Nucleic acid binder design. Sequence first.
RNA 1: AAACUUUCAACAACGGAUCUCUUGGUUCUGGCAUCGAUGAAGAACGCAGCGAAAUGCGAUAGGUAAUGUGAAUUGCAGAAUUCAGUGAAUCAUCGAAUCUUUGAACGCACAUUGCGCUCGCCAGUAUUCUGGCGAGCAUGCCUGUUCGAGCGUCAUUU
RNA 2: CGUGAGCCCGGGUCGAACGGCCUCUAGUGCAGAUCUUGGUGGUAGUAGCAAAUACUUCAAUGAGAACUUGAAGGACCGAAGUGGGGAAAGGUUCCAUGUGAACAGCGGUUGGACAUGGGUUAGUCGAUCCUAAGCCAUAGGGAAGUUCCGUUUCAAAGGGGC
RNA 3: AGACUAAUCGAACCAUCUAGUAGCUGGUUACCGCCGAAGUUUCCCUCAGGAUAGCAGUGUUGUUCUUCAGUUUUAUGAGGU
RNA 4: CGGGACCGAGGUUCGCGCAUCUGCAAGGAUGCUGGCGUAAUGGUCAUCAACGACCCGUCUUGAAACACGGACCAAGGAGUCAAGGUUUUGCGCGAGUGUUUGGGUGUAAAACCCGCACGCGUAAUGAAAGUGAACGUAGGUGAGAGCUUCGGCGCAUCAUCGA
RNA 5: UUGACCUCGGAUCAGGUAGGAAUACCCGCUGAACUUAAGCAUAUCAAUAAGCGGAGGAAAAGAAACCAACAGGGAUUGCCCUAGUAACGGCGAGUGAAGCGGCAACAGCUCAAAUUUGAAAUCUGGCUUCGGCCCGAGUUGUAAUUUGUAGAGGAAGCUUUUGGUGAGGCACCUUCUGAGUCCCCUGGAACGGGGCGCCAUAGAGGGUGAGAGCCCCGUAUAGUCGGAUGCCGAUCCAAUGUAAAGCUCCUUCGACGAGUCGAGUAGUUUGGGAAUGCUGCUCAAAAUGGGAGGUAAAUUUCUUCUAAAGCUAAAUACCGGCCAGAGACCGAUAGCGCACAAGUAGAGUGAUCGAAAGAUGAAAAGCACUUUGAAAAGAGGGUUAAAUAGCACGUGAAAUUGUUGAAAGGGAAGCGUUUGUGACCAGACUUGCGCCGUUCCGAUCAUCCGGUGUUCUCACCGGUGCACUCGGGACGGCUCAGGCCAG
Lengths: 121, 258, 213
Amino acid sequence: VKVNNSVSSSRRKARKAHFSAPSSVRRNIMSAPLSKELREKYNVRSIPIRKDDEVTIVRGSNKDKEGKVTSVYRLKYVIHVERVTRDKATGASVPVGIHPSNVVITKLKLDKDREAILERI
Amino acid sequence: VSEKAGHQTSAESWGTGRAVARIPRVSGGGTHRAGQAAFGNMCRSGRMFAPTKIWRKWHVKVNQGQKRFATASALAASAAAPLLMARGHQVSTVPEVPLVVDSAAFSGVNKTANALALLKAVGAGADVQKAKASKKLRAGKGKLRDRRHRQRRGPLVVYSAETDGKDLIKGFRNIPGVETSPVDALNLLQLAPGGHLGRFIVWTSAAIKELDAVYESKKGFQLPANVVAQADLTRLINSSEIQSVLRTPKGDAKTKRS
Amino acid sequence: AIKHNQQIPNNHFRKDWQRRVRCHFDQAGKKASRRVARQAKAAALAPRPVDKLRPIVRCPTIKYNRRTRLGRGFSLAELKAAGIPKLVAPTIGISVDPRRANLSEESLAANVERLKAYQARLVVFPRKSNKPKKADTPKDQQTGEFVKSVEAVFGVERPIASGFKEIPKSELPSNIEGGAFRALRKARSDAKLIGVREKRAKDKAAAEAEKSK
RNA sequence: AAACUUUCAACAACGGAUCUCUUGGUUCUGGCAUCGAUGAAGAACGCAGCGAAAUGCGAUAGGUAAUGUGAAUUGCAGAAUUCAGUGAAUCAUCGAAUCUUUGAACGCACAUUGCGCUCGCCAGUAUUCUGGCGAGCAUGCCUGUUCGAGCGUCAUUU
RNA sequence: CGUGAGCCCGGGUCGAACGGCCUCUAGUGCAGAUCUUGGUGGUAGUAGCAAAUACUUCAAUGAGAACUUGAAGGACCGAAGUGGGGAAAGGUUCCAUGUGAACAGCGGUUGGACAUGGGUUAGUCGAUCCUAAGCCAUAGGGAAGUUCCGUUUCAAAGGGGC
RNA sequence: AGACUAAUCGAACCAUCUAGUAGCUGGUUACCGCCGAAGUUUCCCUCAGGAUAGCAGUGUUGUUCUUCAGUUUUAUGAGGU
RNA sequence: CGGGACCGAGGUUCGCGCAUCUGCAAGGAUGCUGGCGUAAUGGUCAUCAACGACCCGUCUUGAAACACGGACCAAGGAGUCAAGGUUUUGCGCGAGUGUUUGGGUGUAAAACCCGCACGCGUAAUGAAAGUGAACGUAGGUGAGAGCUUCGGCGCAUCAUCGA
RNA sequence: UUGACCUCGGAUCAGGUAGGAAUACCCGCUGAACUUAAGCAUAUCAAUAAGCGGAGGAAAAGAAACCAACAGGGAUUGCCCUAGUAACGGCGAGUGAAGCGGCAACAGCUCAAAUUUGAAAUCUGGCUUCGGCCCGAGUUGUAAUUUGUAGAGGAAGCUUUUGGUGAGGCACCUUCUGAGUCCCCUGGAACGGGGCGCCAUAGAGGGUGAGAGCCCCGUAUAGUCGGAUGCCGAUCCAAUGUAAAGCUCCUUCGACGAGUCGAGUAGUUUGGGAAUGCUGCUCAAAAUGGGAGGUAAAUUUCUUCUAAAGCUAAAUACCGGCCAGAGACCGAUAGCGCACAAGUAGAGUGAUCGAAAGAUGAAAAGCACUUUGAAAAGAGGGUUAAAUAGCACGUGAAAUUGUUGAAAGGGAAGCGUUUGUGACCAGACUUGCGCCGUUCCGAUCAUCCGGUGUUCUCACCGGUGCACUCGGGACGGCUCAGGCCAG
Ligand SMILES: [Mg+2]
Ligand SMILES: [Mg+2]
Ligand SMILES: [Mg+2]
Ligand SMILES: [Mg+2]
Ligand SMILES: [Mg+2]
Ligand SMILES: [Mg+2]
Ligand SMILES: [Mg+2]
Ligand SMILES: [Mg+2]
Ligand SMILES: [Mg+2]
Ligand SMILES: [Mg+2]
Ligand SMILES: [Mg+2]
Ligand SMILES: [Mg+2]
Ligand SMILES: [Mg+2]
Ligand SMILES: [Mg+2]
Ligand SMILES: [Mg+2]
Ligand SMILES: [Mg+2]
Ligand SMILES: [Mg+2]
Ligand SMILES: [Mg+2]
Ligand SMILES: [Mg+2]
Ligand SMILES: [Mg+2]
Ligand SMILES: [Mg+2]
Ligand SMILES: [Mg+2]
Ligand SMILES: [Mg+2]
Ligand SMILES: [Mg+2]
Ligand SMILES: [Mg+2]
Ligand SMILES: [Mg+2]
Ligand SMILES: [Mg+2]
Ligand SMILES: [Mg+2]
Ligand SMILES: [Mg+2]
Ligand SMILES: [Mg+2]
Ligand SMILES: [Mg+2]
Ligand SMILES: [Mg+2]
Ligand SMILES: [Mg+2]
Ligand SMILES: [Mg+2]
Ligand SMILES: [Mg+2]
Ligand SMILES: [Mg+2]
Ligand SMILES: [Mg+2]
Ligand SMILES: [Mg+2]
Ligand SMILES: [Mg+2]
Ligand SMILES: [Mg+2]
Ligand SMILES: [Mg+2]
Ligand SMILES: [Mg+2]
Ligand SMILES: [Mg+2]
Ligand SMILES: [Mg+2]
Ligand SMILES: [Mg+2]
Ligand SMILES: [Mg+2]
Ligand SMILES: [Mg+2]
Ligand SMILES: [Mg+2]
Ligand SMILES: [Mg+2]
Ligand SMILES: [Mg+2]
Ligand SMILES: [Mg+2]
Ligand SMILES: [Mg+2]
């Protein structure tokens, strides 16, 4: 169970904090698991998705496609993946939103800030 | 409810002569709430009948001595196989109902993996598995407030706080339905949940030693006597003492029609 | 609006009482916070006891004088006899009460031996451990097995004197000569007629007897 | 016989009940003590690339500085040099600032964007007039400063 | 199925929760209260859209013209006007361009409607200056106080030159 | 003229005390089973209301060779229609 | 002794009886036969027909009223809570009883434990000063459920004379 | 003439301070009526609401001119009890404390009244800040001693005092720490079902395209990546006595608060009753004096405190402000007036009054294109799991309405009992149990373990089997029972 008088277990408060989270908090919520090859190499379970990471979709009707991430769209809590699109009435292609928890990161964009993050975990 | 609810307005009755009910009505002329009724339980934005107060008797004072009488009865009912089964526990493979496990086995049950294995070995596995597989979603507005699930009660592990130690309870928390209790507390709400007797209790060896000392330390409470000495009516009625004085049956179970 | 064989009501509920209803839902919450405050005080006061030594006093009415309880503080007469300066006792956990007075030697003696008993068991650490003074407890006498609360050990032991004494028949006390009931009746009559007898002593005839030689 | 009136069913209407939910209320419990003449609470008017309201802010105006995080914002182009960045964001923290006209509101007024006075600087031939900019001018009370008044009163000269 | 309150099943719609049994609990059962709130009828395509004399022809625009526009004819206000200006009050109704719905109790291509832009220039007009009836400070005096009286008083009150 | 004092005047309007009091009017929410009335006595600033007794229900208990009766007969009184 | 109508409850034997070596009409229907085996019986609904049937709620001696409220529908809508009493029911202890003002402890507003005082009760009666409940198997008499060694003993309760 | 002192003024002089907001709780003043008394005037409501002034995190009170009458307790506050009691009251309705006792908390102090008088030893302000200096305040009294528990003066004795250095152990925030997206089916999408696993000091909660411990955030234990400040002590090392503090002693003294105490009277208040408190007016004290000791007064004793100056934390109140955690609460006519651009739109000259209004879908994928129309739109067509979700959007009741279908109707209709007619429909029935006739499997009995109600049975195994046993299906015969309506 939970034994911490400073932490609430209220459904109403939990949902309010989720949908009213600022941009920095929404970054941490929007995280995805790493692949087995990346897990053994870095000893890290999951990190937040950057714009330029390459992922593979695991759940949904696009559950086998893969490609570079093109937009981490924090306001709707969704990820836009390259070539994972959908056609409007006019025939133009628009991206579909994929929740970060439905994908697995197969390749990281390593930068010295991310490299520091991986060392911390 | 708030004590101001339904009374944050200055409505006054219009009286007779206007072809409307004599109930107080809002004033003004620029809103939908122009001549709407304000005070009263029948109105749309009025107050409830007899608004609830915090003065209500929430807590009940039960005599210490009826609490102890019931706790002893709950412990006694925990020692009967029919009352365990009639409650709904899976005790089909338990050797003896007062299931007492040697306190030396609880040495390394501070880990949930070991604690679960111990309950399976002693014959409490079926009851433990039943509680886990019964998690449902409750019906009603309980889910809205805080109560989301209902998952049945399993065995109750009873130990000694001074000999067994406090590390036992660490390994018994995540197991659904399994709850612990020191031998010197014995909450009745855990011994007869819902008012139904026959909780399945798993004692430690040390807790059995101290059960006599616990009920002899309680001052002002002696173990109660019973209104009937022999609680088995079959031997009482079919005794040679009773049957020898009966003046023969005057009829039969089913009477011949006149 | 009385209707039957009722008891005449005495419900003082005619003064808008609903505004001043105090419900004690924080009884459990206050108890937990009081214990938290007590723990903090004990930690700051360690190794000193959390409370102060108090005397034994007799309850002040004919209904309660049969019993003794704890007083506010030791009188100046008790402190002087015990050999403790008045302005030193508060610094070593003794409660001082300058208002109290001793009218009996028995109560004074009982409180003095209590002061001496506490002084015997008291350990006073030096004001600076490098150089102990005459009145500071030596380092060897200090042991570390101290007591938490004084009132637990220095409480009342026999608040009411026992009534289970047994005596040999040879030591049987004698009876009142005229009867114990008559002793009480005579005592009441003497107090009732004390002024009448004194007025006539002292009588106008007795004054006349004094006047007439 | 049709029409009309009445009853029922299917479908279609009107209406928003019922069911389920819920970033809301309500009550209880626990902890804390922090507004203002160094100008508060409130009020008015403004500020966004594209905004009316809400929210935020004040001519440094949907905001600056500083710190932390670490790659966004999003309805469209606009940031792609901000990619080692010496650092995005309607982010979080917040210790430095800005803070229009008012308001206890304080030069006098105010139903007026009215009428004044003192000092300093700049420009107009200007110690006096005109314009611009800056700093000022309420009341009561307290301590001290300095300038006084009164045959209230002391001493001396006189 | 049950005497009954009700319970159960089949068929259609629907999309995320729900029920039986034993105890505990209550803001627990509606036909009415000129009950409350919301919605809907018959009446009923009914009453009615009748003061201020009054309109007609052609053409254009337009899907559509009695109440849009131009021309022609006929009329009315008849200078204490249905004219030309303002004070108070209103606040963009002013002007141009365009227009689906709603509004103009009939229509509408028209509009004080809707949408986008534009529009108000002062040494000489007015405010600002003066005082009137009156209101408010100051000195003071009341009042527990919010404050009341006082406007020259029983005040050491101000204004200029070198 | 009891006239006018914001469609308000034989004492304006606003908010609160305030859910003011009302022996008076109106309403008062499922089923079945069993029992089942009173408008009479006394007192009351009582006469549209109360208290009191009566009529009714329920829960019991002593018991259940329980005892009596809105009745007749026999014997014997009273009454003043 | 005939003619007709309605009914067949119950569900092994037992009984009351009659007859005689069989049994029966005697403590409640059996036997034989026929058609159909499905919408034929049956049910629901609609409709016609025979007979009957005033509009509900309410106040009232009396309402269908020419007494009042009611155009219709949905949702909301009125004997609740606290303190203090009393009678009754269930429960624990019982000359005692009540932990929870408070303290210890805790899986932490729960549960468990603790004790001093205190409340009510154990003694009443006087305005009060005050006094304060056994002659006796805690009495005699009558009734009294029950028990009885059949001669008696006799709970509760009532009546009565006492202390 | 000059220089002082006293009093009263000026200054945009130097430096400061007050107002307003808020007022849930707190300290005062002022102050009703509705209501109860079945009327009403005292009473009650109520020493309450409204009004006014003033603070804080608490406020206030507070170290006895107390309570008591006892073997005496010993500042204040709060709870339980005292106690619905003593008492007050048209002695009616009604109101109504306090001592003692148990507990929470605990804490004591500062002045006036004395000559430092062999030395105003005291303080604001300016300059200097480098030690100090210079005006001023002040002798009409600033420092030191003393406060009734005492104290002062004695003379003997004993005894007391300061700086440092910090472990860490709290208090502050801040990084990090477990396990499946394994296979099949349904589904638009598994977070569902079935199977196989793993973590758990973590199976609280939330999100993710449906019920997710292991997909994500978090959740449970510590201990580590850090840093801000200030509180406390455990060991250790430094010192020193000026002239300061105590303790025992008895002789001597021993200042102690005035228009106050008290008394009368008036008003109000109180349970306070020949007057409990407060206030106005009149009178107006004393030194073992004064006050109190719940019945007015005179006389004589006794007990307990020491008024008319002041400060002081805790236990206590409060959800108004800020921040948290919860609920046998409400669930969009409910819950706050406000789940929404709510004290908003709107009304009133104004004081003020004050609403209604939540939900497409997992994702706008919010209907491309063709055709009719002036256009709104319609018809095809397309998106979606679904448009029987089209922004007039979850589901979509009733009142009321349209079409289709089925009926009936001579100044109401509805309704009860009972048939007939028409439409529609649920049951029941279809066979079952027995005995004798065909084709395939193991029965009686005994051994050998193991259980058991101590004599029954299960395990392997000899049962050996076509008109012979046991069981089962195949096809025939007979008896019995079996639905509806009837003679
Ligand atoms: Mg009408
Ligand atoms: Mg019909
Ligand atoms: Mg759904
Ligand atoms: Mg209700
Ligand atoms: Mg309803
Ligand atoms: Mg209704
Ligand atoms: Mg109505
Ligand atoms: Mg017409
Ligand atoms: Mg007309
Ligand atoms: Mg003219
Ligand atoms: Mg004009
Ligand atoms: Mg125009
Ligand atoms: Mg029109
Ligand atoms: Mg039109
Ligand atoms: Mg004035
Ligand atoms: Mg007249
Ligand atoms: Mg008028
Ligand atoms: Mg009213
Ligand atoms: Mg009378
Ligand atoms: Mg009536
Ligand atoms: Mg009666
Ligand atoms: Mg006569
Ligand atoms: Mg016959
Ligand atoms: Mg039929
Ligand atoms: Mg038929
Ligand atoms: Mg008919
Ligand atoms: Mg008829
Ligand atoms: Mg009714
Ligand atoms: Mg009548
Ligand atoms: Mg009539
Ligand atoms: Mg009527
Ligand atoms: Mg009507
Ligand atoms: Mg107790
Ligand atoms: Mg007792
Ligand atoms: Mg007797
Ligand atoms: Mg009255
Ligand atoms: Mg009345
Ligand atoms: Mg009256
Ligand atoms: Mg007030
Ligand atoms: Mg204070
Ligand atoms: Mg009592
Ligand atoms: Mg009172
Ligand atoms: Mg008086
Ligand atoms: Mg008064
Ligand atoms: Mg008085
Ligand atoms: Mg004070
Ligand atoms: Mg659907
Ligand atoms: Mg739908
Ligand atoms: Mg819909
Ligand atoms: Mg309908
Ligand atoms: Mg006709
Ligand atoms: Mg039929």
